[PDB]
Amino acid sequence: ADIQTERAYQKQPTIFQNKKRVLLGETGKEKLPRYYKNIGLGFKTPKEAIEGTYIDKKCPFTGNVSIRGRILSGVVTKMKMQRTIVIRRDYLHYIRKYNRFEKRHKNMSVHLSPCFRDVQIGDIVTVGECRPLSKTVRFNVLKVTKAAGTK
Amino acid sequence: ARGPKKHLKRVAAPKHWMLDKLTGVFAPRPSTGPHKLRECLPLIIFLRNRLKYALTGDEVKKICMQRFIKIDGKVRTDITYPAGFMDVISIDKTGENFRLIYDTKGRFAVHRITPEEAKYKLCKVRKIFVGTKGIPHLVTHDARTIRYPDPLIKVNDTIQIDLETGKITDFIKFDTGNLCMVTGGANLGRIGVITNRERHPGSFDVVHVKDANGNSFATRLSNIFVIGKGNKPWISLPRGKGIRLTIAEERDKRLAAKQSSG
Amino acid sequence: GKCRGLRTARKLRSHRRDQKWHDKQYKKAHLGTALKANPFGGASHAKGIVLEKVGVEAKQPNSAIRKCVRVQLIKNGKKITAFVPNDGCLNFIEENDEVLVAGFGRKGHAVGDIPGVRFKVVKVANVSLLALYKGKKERPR
Amino acid sequence: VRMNVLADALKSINNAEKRGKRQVLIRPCSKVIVRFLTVMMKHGYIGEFEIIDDHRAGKIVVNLTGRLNKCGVISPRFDVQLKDLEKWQNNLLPSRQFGFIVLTTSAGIMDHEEARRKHTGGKILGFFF
Amino acid sequence: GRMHAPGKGLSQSALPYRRSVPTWLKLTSDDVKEQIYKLAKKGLTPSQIGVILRDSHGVAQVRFVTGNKILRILKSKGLAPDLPEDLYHLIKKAVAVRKHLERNRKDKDAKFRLILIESRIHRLARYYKTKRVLPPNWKYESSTASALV
RNA sequence: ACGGGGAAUCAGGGUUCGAUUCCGGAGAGGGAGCCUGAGAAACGGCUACCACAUCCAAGGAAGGCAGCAGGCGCGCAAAUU
RNA sequence: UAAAGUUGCUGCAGUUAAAAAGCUCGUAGUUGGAUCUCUCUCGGCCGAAGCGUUUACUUUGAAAAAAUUAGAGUGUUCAAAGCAGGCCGCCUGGAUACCGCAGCUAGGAAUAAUGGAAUAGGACCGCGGUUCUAUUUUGUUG
RNA sequence: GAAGACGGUCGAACUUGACUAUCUAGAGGAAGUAAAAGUCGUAACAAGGUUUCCGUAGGUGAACCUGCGGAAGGAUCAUUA
């Protein structure tokens, strides 16, 4: 489970990992301090974020992003990108002339932190608005709700 | 496009200036200052349109350049200077002082005050921050930075400052039961007692206010300006005491006044 | 029958939009083919040069010779046959002069017993045919 | 297949009233059917009715007073606001003196006059006059 | 009417109003369950179990005596077929008509009926996959149909 | 096809329009690149090329009215240098 | 544009006037039967704290430029308009409504929906058994 | 610190290659459309004088004719133990 899989060293920029230790008081890797924050609006930090080891600069809990703006929801449809998933948001648009609605949808590419493991296609995810993380990504997954049709 | 605009079309001006459309193409574009463009009152509007002391903008310029107008105790020669909520306008030559207070219809009333009450004003604080070697600071709705404020003064409270020295004299906490004024929106100009505040994290808070006659309304927290402790005001209220009358009672009072007076 | 569902707005809208193309007026006014085929090009009037005078025979049920002029429009160079309305008014028109020509009143359709004519002369030599007819004005020298 | 059992119930009542019958058998029964019939009966249009309990889905035998001209369903059940209610009454009712639009509101199933009394809009179920 | 035929038939059972165990039934619930287990061990489907219990021993409805349906009882003890009985019979019919069509390629009515049967199979399988009775990747294929029968 | 506020009948519903004085955007003959400046990829700023076009003593120099007026042209179609 | 219920959502028509595919499966779409009425802190009716299963409604409450439109007042000499107008220096007005949809907030839960226990892998209880201890103590810190 | 090609960048232009849709020129060929008893010559409408028509194939001096299957919109709602 190597973390350093890139050409540059991966580490949380806040945590200093070169502090001097004591020889007689150290036997094995003692601890690596973990940087994590609690995002607002009542969202609880997942356990895997606090006690994990992954490095994600776009993670809402262990990264540099701040959640602000719209809190949305959607269902996972594709998981074929690194730390990024595609969710679909279905809604009904009212046509005034016919007094009726039509089904419409929009796909949003949202960032999924490694603190959410075993997220499946069809799960309901709560996303929060953040700064542009890529060309199309502007939302971060904050909570994953398992689908009713799951194990 | 290409840098800031310097004109204001007369029909794009704030509606509470009560400007008419046939006078000209332009309205006096208020200069930058302690108050926002859409919720201020340019000195020319007050001196010409309200007080009728001048007939044209040239006469307003003459009055202002004679150093007769004092806003918050300072002589202001700018005829488009933005004067706003709780600002004190003192004209020493004619010996009258005005305080810019919204009337119940959302417009700046010509509210005359005694010279004793013209020596201070109420300022809602916008932020408190610590800077420059642990020195607390305080920013008001009037864009005044007051150093070394009382540690009990937090955001959304209103302080009372003496105009001559520019120092905090007293303050009122933001709490239920305190009298307040609405400075924006549909209920702008109304005066009542704060009854309940609903907090919406990540969004705007809602404050519920009740009048003296029991009418209850609500507005966003940014639009609340607490006037006094409890139900008594620290400043003098306009001819209407912040009560908004429905059009039926307005018409009834107008008809009764027409009947009684001949 | 037609669909009646709370989520049938798209179906109703698309069906109406597709069925509107089976309306003659709608297809004529929105396809744009009738616009390019219009000699006036969407204009109410046009100015042309009288190429010759022609008399077109009336349609079968009644007999007459309709005094028309073959004109060439200035804007696009198209050739046009225009009816000269009143009597003697063909004498007010000379070959190779400017005429203002309007429609015949049926929006590109032939009017009356005149076959294949949908334009009429309004002014000749910058003076109206009615002023010349009523004697209010004379032909410029 | 059979959708909108209320439409079937109202069509059966209308057809039996046109034929001049004194009783109509409605099946299957439903809660909405019973509420619509109760609203009808409070206004004197339909009279007493009995719910036959078979162990799957009830049937209703409805006595028929000859007072009913037409009972109809509105499909789909459009959401109606209190400001759009007058347009619906002009579209559906013979006059402003008689005739009722039955709405389903969070305050229950009732006619348009009660819905305006309780200051509630809802979803249009049907009408009767 | 029928889903794949123009017929509109009214033939079906008419359950009586009384949900009680009949007076003639001296068989308690546990004896009924034991007979259900024995009949299932003999290799009978729930429909056949119900038919035999109604015909020979005399049980108006197993649900009114034991409180559970036959398939639920079989699943509770654990004797139920891996795939549902109606789907199994549809697959069996499809296999039969496919085997017939191999030596009867000119039978163009058999091809049409096979298409209808496979449509029924696909609809039923989709329903069962919706309710997790079948694995989400359960697929019916002609080359593998006889492997399920 | 600049967008919107909005405009043309009132049964209810709609159908058309919105270049046009207010708001937002874009452009200054067409592209492109810049200096200054808080703010411009500015054109009543500059530098080129492309298309037009002015004075010349033929070496050169100077241009940008979709600003107000006015011309020509185009046109069915629109005002006072 | 209305007339055009000749584009029909309201609200058309399809045997013979123009018209239902030769027929049947079928995915998306649309529609879909009955059925459910010491949890919580200053004083024995109060802010906080709510996963009530998210919703769709419905009704509120904020925020939605002015001008235009609707509309209140006001004898422009009447009116279109305008935002203004008398009384041997004082009184006033310069309102209000609407502002679709989509966002934000708040009752009751009728009515598309969504069904939380079915190999039980389902509240509450006694065990803290190596651990963080009102960010380990509570005579002069062990 | 005042001119000038060069690890370069943005980049108008400029010739050469394909030969691009809104646009036009000729004797043409096929066809459509407007009332015209246009030199022996009638397909349909009555059983229209071979009942009409549909699909599909041939053939024709023209409507048309013929074969096969079909329809009644037929000239039969009917034909007898």
Domain boundaries along the sequence of chain B: 1-116, 121-171, 174-244
E20 touches chain D (CB under 8 A): no
Spatial CB neighbours of E81, under 8 Å, sequence gap ≥ 6: E45, E88
CB B13 within 8 A of CB B27: yes
Rounded, the Å distance between the CA of C115 and C1' of G5 is 36
E3 touches strand G (CB under 7 A): yes
Local structure of residue A70 (DSSP, 8 states) = -
Task: Please name the residue that has the structure tokens 């303050």.
Answer: B171
Would the CB atoms of B201 and A40 count as touching at under 8 Å? yes
Peptide bond into D28 cis (omega under 30): yes
C5 touches chain A (CB under 8 A): yes
- From B36, B87, B44, select the one nearest B65 (Cα to Cα): B44
CA distance A73 to E87: 38
CA angle E90, E96, E100 (to 5 degrees): 145
**Neighbour-count burial of E87, counting CB atoms closer than 10 A to its CB (0-12 exposed, 13-18 middle, 19+ buried):** buried
Q: Residue A87: which domain range?
A: 1-151
A and C touching (3 or more beta-carbon pairs closer than 8 Å) = yes
Instruction: Measuring from the CA of residue C76 to each C1' atom, give the nucleotide at the shortest distance.
Output: F75
Instruction: Tell me which amino acid residue B240 is.
Output: G
CA distance A36 to A39: 10
**Neighbour-count burial of A22, counting CB atoms closer than 10 A to its CB (0-12 exposed, 13-18 middle, 19+ buried):** exposed
Domain B121-171 superfamily per CATH: Ribosomal protein S4, central domain (2.40.50.740)
DSSP string, E65-87: HHSS-HHHHHHHHT---SS-HHH
- From B65, B64, B118, B121, select the one nearest B96 (Cα to Cα): B118
CB B121 within 8 A of CB B164: no
Would the CB atoms of A98 and C13 count as touching at under 8 Å? yes
CA distance A113 to C39: 67
* Minimal CA separation from A76 to chain C, in Å: 24
Would the CB atoms of E19 and D55 count as touching at under 8 Å? yes
- From C134, C136, C22, select the one nearest C89 (Cα to Cα): C134
Q: Which of chain A's residues 40-99 bind strand G, using a 7 Å CB cutoff?
A: 42, 70, 73, 91-94, 97-99
Three-state DSSP class for residue A127: strand
* Minimal CA separation from C12 to chain A, in Å: 8
B25 touches strand F (CB under 7 A): yes
CB C47 within 8 A of CB C78: no
Residue of D nearest to E18 (CA): D55
CA distance C121 to D101: 62
E24 touches chain D (CB under 8 A): no
Q: Which residues of E touch D54 (CB under 8 A)?
A: 17
C-beta neighbour count of E12 within 10 angstroms: 6
* D contact residues 54-73, partner E, Cβ 8 Å cutoff: 54-55
Would the CB atoms of D54 and E17 count as touching at under 8 Å? yes
Peptide bond into D94 cis (omega under 30): no
Q: At C27, list the tokens.
A: 């297809």
Instruction: Measuring from the CA of residue C115 to each C1' atom, give the nucleotide at the shortest distance.
Output: H34
Local structure of residue A150 (DSSP, 8 states) = -
Task: Please name the residue that has the structure tokens 């806003």.
Answer: B71
Three-state SS string over chain C comes to: CCCCCCCCHHHHHHHHHHHHHHCHHHHHHHHCHHHHHCCCCCCCEEEEEEEEEEEEECCCCCCCEEEEEEEEECCCCCEEEEECCCCCHHHHCCCCCEEEEEECCCCCCCCCCCCCCCEEEEEECCEEHHHHHHCCCCCCC
* Minimal CA separation from A87 to chain C, in Å: 23
Rounded, the Å distance between the CA of A61 and C1' of G134 is 28
Spatial CB neighbours of E115, under 8 Å, sequence gap ≥ 6: none
Q: At D12, list the tokens.
A: 């059966």
Topology of the domain comprising B1-116: 3.10.290
CA distance C81 to C120: 8
Three-state DSSP class for residue A97: coil
* Minimal CA separation from A105 to chain B, in Å: 26
- From B94, B111, B144, select the one nearest B41 (Cα to Cα): B111
Rounded, the Å distance between the CA of B4 and C1' of H2 is 38
D2 touches chain E (CB under 8 A): no
Would the CB atoms of D54 and E15 count as touching at under 8 Å? no
Backbone angles phi, psi at B127, to 5 degrees: -150, 155
Q: How far is CA A115 from CA A56, A62, D40, in A?
A: 10, 9, 59
Instruction: Measuring from the CA of residue B222 to each C1' atom, give the nucleotide at the shortest distance.
Output: G62
D55 touches strand G (CB under 7 A): no
C127-128 and C119-124 strand pairing: antiparallel
Nucleotides of H under 7 A from a protein CB: 23, 34-35
Q: Which chains reach chain E with 3 or more Cβ–Cβ distances below 8 angstroms?
A: D
CA distance A51 to A63: 14
Three-state SS string over chain B comes to: CCCCCCCCECCCCCHHHCCCCCCCCECCCCCCCCCCHHHCEEHHHHHHHHCCCCCCHHHHHHHHHCCCEEECCEECCCCCCEECCCCEEEECCCCEEEEEEECCCCCEEEEEECCCHHHEEEEEEEEEEEECCCEEEEEECCCCECCCCCCCCCCCCEEEEECCCCEEEEEECCCCCCEEEECCCCCCCCEEEEEEEECCCCCCCEEEEECCCCCEEEEEHHHEEEEECCCCCCCCCCCCCCCCCCHHHHHHHHHHHHHHCC
CATH assignment of the domain containing A71: 2.40.50.1000
Q: At B64, list the tokens.
A: 């202002």
Would the CB atoms of C13 and A92 count as touching at under 8 Å? no
- From C105, C103, C134, select the one nearest C120 (Cα to Cα): C103
CA distance B257 to E137: 85
CA distance D112 to D104: 10
- For residue A78, give the H/E element and its range: strand A71-81
CB B48 within 8 A of CB B55: yes
CA distance D51 to D25: 10
Q: Which residues of D touch C4 (CB under 8 A)?
A: 75-76
Q: Given A93, A97, A100, which is nearest C6 (Cβ)? A: A100
D2 touches strand G (CB under 7 A): yes
Q: Which residues of C touch D74 (CB under 8 A)?
A: none
Q: Which residues of A touch C10 (CB under 8 A)?
A: 95, 102-103
Residue of D nearest to E19 (CA): D55
Q: At A17, list the tokens.
A: 């990992």
Beta-bridged to residue D111, according to DSSP, are D102
Local structure of residue A46 (DSSP, 8 states) = P
* Minimal CA separation from E71 to chain D, in Å: 21
Q: How many domains does chain C have?
A: 1
Task: Please name the residue that has the structure tokens 């209808």.
Answer: E116
Q: Which residues of C touch A93 (CB under 8 A)?
A: 9
B206 touches strand G (CB under 7 A): yes
CA distance E142 to E149: 12
Tell me which CATH code domain E81-149 carries.
1.10.287.10
Q: At A59, list the tokens.
A: 């993670």
Measured over the CA atoms of residue E114, residue E117, residue E123 and residue E125, the dihedral's sign is: negative
Q: At B52, list the tokens.
A: 């009728």
Residue of A nearest to C7 (CA): A101
Rounded-to-10 torsion of CA C22, C24, C26, C29: 140
Tell me which CATH code domain B174-244 carries.
2.30.30.30
- For residue A86, give the H/E element and its range: strand A84-95
For D1-68, the fitting CATH number among 3.30.1370.30, 3.90.45.10, 1.10.150.130, 3.40.50.300 is 3.30.1370.30
Topology of the domain comprising D69-129: Dna Ligase; domain 1 (3.30.1490)
Three-state DSSP class for residue D53: coil
Q: Given A92, A93, A100, which is nearest C12 (Cβ)? A: A100
Do the domains B121-171 and B1-116 match in fold?
no
CB B20 within 8 A of CB B37: no
Q: Which residues of A touch B201 (CB under 8 A)?
A: 40-42
D52 touches chain E (CB under 8 A): no
Instruction: Tell me which amino acid residue E147 is.
Output: A
Q: Residue C79: which domain range?
A: 1-141
A100-111 and A139-145 strand pairing: parallel
Closest residue, by C-alpha, to the C1' of G23: E112
B204 touches strand G (CB under 7 A): yes
Task: Please name the residue that has the structure tokens 């969004």.
Answer: B203
C-beta neighbour count of D127 within 10 angstroms: 23
Beta-bridged to residue C83, according to DSSP, are C68, C120
CA distance B22 to B7: 17
CA distance B103 to B121: 17
Q: At B120, list the tokens.
A: 């201070």
* Minimal CA separation from A34 to chain C, in Å: 50
Three-state DSSP class for residue E120: helix
Residue range(s) occupied by CATH 1.10.287.10 in chain E: 81-149
